[PDB]
Design a protein around this nucleic acid. Structure first.
Lengths: 146, 124, 50, 206, 119
RNA sequence: AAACUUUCAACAACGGAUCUCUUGGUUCUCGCAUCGAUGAAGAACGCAGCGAAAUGCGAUACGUAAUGUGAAUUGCAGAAUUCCGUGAAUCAUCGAAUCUUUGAACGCACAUUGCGCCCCUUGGUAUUCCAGGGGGCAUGCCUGUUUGAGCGUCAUU
RNA sequence: CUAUCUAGCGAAACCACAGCCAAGGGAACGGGCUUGGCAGAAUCAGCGGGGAAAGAAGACCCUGUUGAGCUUGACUCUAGU
RNA sequence: CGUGGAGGUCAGUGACGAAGCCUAGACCGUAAGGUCGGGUCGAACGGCCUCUAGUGCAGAUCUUGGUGGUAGUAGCAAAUAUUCAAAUGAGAACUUUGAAGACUGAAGUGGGGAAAGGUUCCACGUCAACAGCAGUUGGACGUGGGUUAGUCGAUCCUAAGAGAUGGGGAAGCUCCGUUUCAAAGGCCUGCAGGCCACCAUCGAAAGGGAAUCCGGUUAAGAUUCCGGAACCUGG
RNA sequence: GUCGAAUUUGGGUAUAGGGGCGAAAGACUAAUCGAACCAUCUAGUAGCUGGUUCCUGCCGAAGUUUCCCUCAGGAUAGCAG
RNA sequence: UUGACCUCAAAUCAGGUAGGAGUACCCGCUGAACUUAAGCAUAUCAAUAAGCGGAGGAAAAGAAACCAACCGGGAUUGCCUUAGUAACGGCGAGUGAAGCGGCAAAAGCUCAAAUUUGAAAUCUGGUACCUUCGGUGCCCGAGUUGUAAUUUGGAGAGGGCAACUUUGGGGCCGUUCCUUGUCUAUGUUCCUUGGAACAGGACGUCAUAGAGGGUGAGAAUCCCGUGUGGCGAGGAGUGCGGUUCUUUGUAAAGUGCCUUCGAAGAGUCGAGUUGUUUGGGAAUGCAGCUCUAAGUGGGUGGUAAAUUCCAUCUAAAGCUAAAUAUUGGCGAGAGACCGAUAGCGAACAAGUACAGUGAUGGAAAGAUGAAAAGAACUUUGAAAAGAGAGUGAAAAAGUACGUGAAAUUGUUGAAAGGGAAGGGCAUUUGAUCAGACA
């Protein structure tokens, strides 16, 4: 009904909503699950650091044409510019895209710099068994900041 | 104060388990402590109870009395002892039922398995 | 009904055995709660529907 | 969600000389003809049945939360408010109480307890060891049988065995300076706990 | 007590059949005695002895058949593993690991490498 | 004045409120993924020494075997051929078997305890009849095997 | 044969509390209220004036922005043809 | 003010008696209500500062349960009718036996069965409950016993009719049809011979239908048992 | 009233709910029929009827306007806190 | 005549498989109304409930015929926000998304279209043997109306030149994870009460154990257990480690530059119309019918049509874990919940008893005591029973049993009473009662 001077509402509760209501009491339990998942994945991982490299990006439309963002993949162009190939890169902790054609020279340069840095910065075990045998990190979200 | 998540301090589950439990586990729940002498001997304090052991009492109206197990009754969580009998008005002798935790052992109806268990538990 | 299915008669023997009182040795069992049968049947009062 | 609703009861109407709540149909059973769906009926549906989407948890401004902790901490240094709850702080060498950081390295409850009696928390630890009482409500069959008082709070910076040495002594709580739970600092919303600081913690507060 | 299968498993089919026949005879006589007298629970033991005997006999035939179909393609359906229906169908380890040759080459050329990020 | 009516207390009755209890319910979070023609779920019937049910099992019938524990069960009797044993218990565990008649249900039927057919074997003189035992007989689809039809169709006698 | 009295058995409807009347006034017909008449335990069989007696949230009537059945050159559609 | 429950606190009360209940005994409070004393009872409970709510009943022809006046009342009155004596037993209007009278009067209150019922049928014991009184009796209670088939029926045949199959429609559970646009088999003599074919199946304890009667027997069964005499089918 | 035919009846069989049957009454369709029974949607909605639980204190109304398929109801103003 | 082929059949042929159940969640299909609109038909409820099909442990979706128009991003799914917005609508009630951005979780890829043509190199089955989730040989068979190798558009193939780079399958033990089992402290000392001490007091002891439970009443120290550690059993397995053998191999991959090129899914796309659905508006998607394409092309670019540019993808074939869902099933752990007229309908022989032809409906019902020690024996009576006696802490606990309320009823006691009772003020009378001092 209508009553005294009040702003007008639009509350969409005419539709058997009570049957379909999700609450998050598992807000904590799922956090536990996720921490446990990450830790366990890492534990089995053979120290590959739980996230693959992702590239620096020019952040679409106007509201965010300013920002710079972590995208998906590194443009085969920039890969072979660094001096390697997509397939070997994927075996390495790297993430590669075929879309996102490079059109901006500085971003080309930046990503190739990232890749060269990372290549110089990591240590790969032989195809055989014996190695320096470990030390784990779980970043690559952070050690190559954006 | 528990730390193991797999355990529960639920009153209901506890009492439930204790009542529904089988003869196997009741064998342990009817465990009893030992005399000072036997404790000095074997470096151990308590055991599951069995038949034909000797025993003395430390509590209850029948405190101080002694005897041997006539029969275990895991279906009532109790014990039955010679030399321990109520005389009804009809004069019938009837055994009294006892919780072993309120007793003390003086002898052991010993067995291969019993001795093996004894050496098994040590007494850390 | 004097010309009756054997299935029927099977059920007759079943009900005949199911209509009785308790054996009394049960009432002396440890931790009993069963003083009398609660499922008895008498043809005068209530029926089987076969 | 289905309670009081498992029935198929529909009203007999009026003209049968009875109230027009919905009645159970059928026959041959005591429930036949009995009142149904309703808060006032037996076997019915309570008024405004309890829902899970009640608001259970409350968002509080973080600054306000920190404010309260700061007030509690400041109240820790007031012997009147600690006495006022019945913390046993009558003798007290001096307040706020600060102890060497070597206490963080204790592994045994016995050694720690002996230290505690020497500093003079014996009477408070007896306040707990004598306050164990049964609970008066229905909590006893909801896994809350025993009630007792709340004892002192030991504040450490680094744990090197003390928390496990103290997890079994009744009434005593432990905390790290970083965390400092208000629930421990102001139990029952009554201000001034008997807090025992360590030297490292007392330094780290700044 | 009565009889024991570990004593019986050393015997043959014929001795076992005779044993079983004797047990059934005795059981019949015990049924006669059961109405002559109010109660007779010695009959339980011979009842369970029959069960044990039949179990052993069944075992002998079954294991004979098993060693007969030892390492044959089609075993009998009552002798295959029961695991569950959906599994008795589902793929084998072989079929699951079957892989095309292109994918084999890519896996061998570029498998996932062990790497670490410090220096 | 009794009786009778009415009120109040005690005591006793009808009744099962209250209080205390609780091997239950409810709600939340976690963890897992496993029905079935290799015959499920469900049903009916029957099974114990002494049981009606519940529970459990299926003619091996409150269960069999193997494993672990290691001397019970229990209302009564019976056991104990033991109790330093390959060995008690309604124990636990469970990987090997039994698994009535049914049921998707599969020889055909099904208000029927109804009527048939094939193989092997056994009794009666029996290839032919009767009976007993044992094993088998659904449909659709696929892969293939064999036999096959079609002036559909090829080559040659 | 009942009712009636007895042996034994043994319900029900209904029940604000209850049960003598007049007049007044009153929701304009009171068992109660005001003023008067009166007023003695416990009662039995019948009795059918009153208890605006009980039976039934009125079936007539009006309403409801409640319905249903039926009809129809009402509004709107429709299987069909 | 008060109820349930939670945090805190009275190093709170308590089996030398907790809460709970009764108390024309008392006290405080305007009051909501609180306290105390006595009796009963037997295991947990309270005061204070806060929190929280499925939170305080006279009603709703409210719900569940229970008890009352009505009332030892209404009333137990159709079907012609009972009576005497014995035995029994604690006890007999009603049980049994016996004797009298009386009925139904074969279109029966008889005897037999189908449907349906399910052990009620029968024996012994037995009356707490039911038999609207009674109760020594019982279609009750308790425990047991008892239902015998080549010839009776079912089983078979088909009727009205239902209902698979091939097929067709249907998104689909399924619907239609049962001389169906089907490549629908079995009869004799491993095979050569040879002839035929709308070929599901279910559907009647009254229809059609192979054949049995006697006499005897039980507490309760019989064309089923016994004795005897026959018949039919198949081989 | 009828009592030898349009009779009566058992058993089997067919017809199912906006459907069935109907020597036609809107009759019958399991004590249910101007639309069966069971469950569900469904706690359907209801401007209408009834009910709505402890104290004390302080304050203290309206039944009028205007518009409404509006006249047993709402909004708005007014009275009140 | 003989032998093939194509097609279609049969067989209790050899071997296989589908059915049904369950169904909380999932993919679909079909598909309402009450209701709301203060009426009502559109609209809403609702693309819901009911009905039907079919799966899994997660499903489904997913590697762009995308979002966009920025300096552009870059599979999908979910959270936050976008937003109660743009939009829809008797523009009334109402409904109502998507991009961007942040986070979670992460993973890519295969078929077709190509001459193996100096050699079907492919595959099922049968059969002997074997180191058997499989393998060698042989045979039969399928198959060119096309199985293998290559390539999947991010490209890529063919040739030419030029070098460079790298590989594998085993056993072995250990480790990991499950199934699990086992060992892992502390008084039952004295006194009080009590039937029992698990209460009180004193005296102690352990504590990475004071959580919980049982035990004749509130038990850290009586028992289980708790906690912390240890020792094993059986299994899965390849994650990890370590060993130890072969040697793939004259075979596979990758890498450069020149050159020729470079196949790319049709009764589909698209359009019209009809119906429905959508926020989707000259038409969001879907389906029916009618029309029906092209290869510097096609789809889209949220106002229809014509014209010219631009931009972004590349359909009509396909696979893919995790994040996410889950009143079901199984195993756990918890609660400011209910506490026997409550809480699941069911704390118990409850979906039971019982009703109904049937579908369906659907109950009520907990508590002796520490232990039956469940009342021996006597007496009256036919007996039930009573009275005794007797156990028990209590029989005011005697199987109708914890406590045991009220209505209601009996006895006793007190009191009143002329057609009601009850109540306020006041007081007598009666019965009873507290309270003051040394």
């Amino acid at each position: 009904a209508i009553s005294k001077n009040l702003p007008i509402l639009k509350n969409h509760f005419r539709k058997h909503w009570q049957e379909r209501v999700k609450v998050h009491f598992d807000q904590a339990g799922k956090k536990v699950s996720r921490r446990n998942a990450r830790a366990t994945r890492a534990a089995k991982i053979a120290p590959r650091p739980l996230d693959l490299l992702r590239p620096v990006v020019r952040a679409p439309t106007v509201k965010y044409n300013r920002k710079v963002r972590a995208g998906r993949g590194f443009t085969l162009a920039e890969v072979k510019a660094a001096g390697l190939t997509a397939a070997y890169a994927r075996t390495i902790g790297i993430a590669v895209d075929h879309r996102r054609q490079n059109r901006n020279q500085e971003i080309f340069d930046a990503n190739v710099q990232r890749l060269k840095e990372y290549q110089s910065k990591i240590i790969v075990f032989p195809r055989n068994g014996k190695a320096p045998e470990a030390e784990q990190v779980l970043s690559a979200a952070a050690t190559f900041p954006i | 104060a528990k730390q193991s998540l797999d355990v529960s301090s639920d009153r209901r589950k506890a009492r439930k388990a204790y009542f529904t439990a089988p003869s196997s586990q009741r064998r342990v729940l009817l465990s009893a402590p030992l005399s000072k002498e036997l404790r000095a001997q074997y470096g151990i304090k308590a055991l599951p109870i069995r038949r034909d052991d000797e025993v003395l009492v430390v509590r209850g109206s029948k405190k101080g009395q002694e005897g041997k197990i006539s029969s275990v009754y895991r279906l009532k969580f109790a014990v039955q002892v010679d030399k321990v009998t109520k005389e009804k008005v009809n004069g019938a002798s009837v055994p009294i039922n006892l919780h072993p935790s309120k007793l003390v052992i003086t002898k052991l109806h010993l067995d291969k398995d019993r001795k093996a268990l004894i050496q098994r538990k040590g007494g850390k | 009904a004097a010309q009756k299915s054997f299935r029927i008669k099977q059920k007759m023997a079943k009900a005949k055995k199911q209509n009785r009182p308790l054996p009394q040795w049960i009432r002396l069992r440890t931790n009993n709660t069963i003083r009398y049968n609660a499922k008895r049947r008498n043809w005068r009062r209530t029926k089987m529907n076969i | 969600e289905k309670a009081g609703h498992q029935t198929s009861a529909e009203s007999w109407g009026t003209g049968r000389a009875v109230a027009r709540i919905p009645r159970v149909g059928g026959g041959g059973t005591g429930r036949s003809g009995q009142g149904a769906f309703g808060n006032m009926c037996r076997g019915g549906r309570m008024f405004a049945p309890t829902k899970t989407w009640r608001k259970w948890n409350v968002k509080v401004n973080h600054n306000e939360k920190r404010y309260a902790t700061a007030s509690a901490i400041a109240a820790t240094a007031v012997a009147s408010l600690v006495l006022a709850r019945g913390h046993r702080v009558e003798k007290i060498p001096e307040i706020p109480l600060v102890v060497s950081t070597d206490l963080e390295s204790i592994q045994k409850t016995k050694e720690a307890v002996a230290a505690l009696k020497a500093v003079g928390a014996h009477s408070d630890l007896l306040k707990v060891l004598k306050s164990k009482k049964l609970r008066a409500g229905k909590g006893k069959y909801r896994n809350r049988r025993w009630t007792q008082r709340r004892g002192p709070l030991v504040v450490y910076a680094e744990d090197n065995g003390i928390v496990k040495a103290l997890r079994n002594v009744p009434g005593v709580e432990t905390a790290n300076v970083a965390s400092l739970n208000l629930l421990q600092l102001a139990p029952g919303a009554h201000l001034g706990r008997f807090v025992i600081w360590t030297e490292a913690a007392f330094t780290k507060l700044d | 007590a009565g009889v024991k299968a570990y004593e019986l498993r050393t015997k043959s089919k014929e001795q076992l059949a005779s044993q079983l026949v004797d047990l059934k005879k005795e059981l019949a006589e015990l049924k006669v005695q059961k109405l002559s007298r109010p109660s007779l629970p010695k009959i339980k033991t011979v009842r369970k002895s029959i069960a044990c005997v039949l179990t052993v006999i069944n075992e002998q035939q079954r294991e004979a058949v098993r060693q007969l179909y030892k390492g044959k393609k089609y075993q009998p359906k009552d002798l295959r593993a029961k695991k569950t229906r959906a599994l008795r169908r589902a793929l084998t380890k072989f079929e699951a690991s079957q892989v095309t040759e292109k994918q084999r080459k890519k896996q061998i050329a570029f498998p996932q490498r062990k790497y670490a990020i410090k220096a």
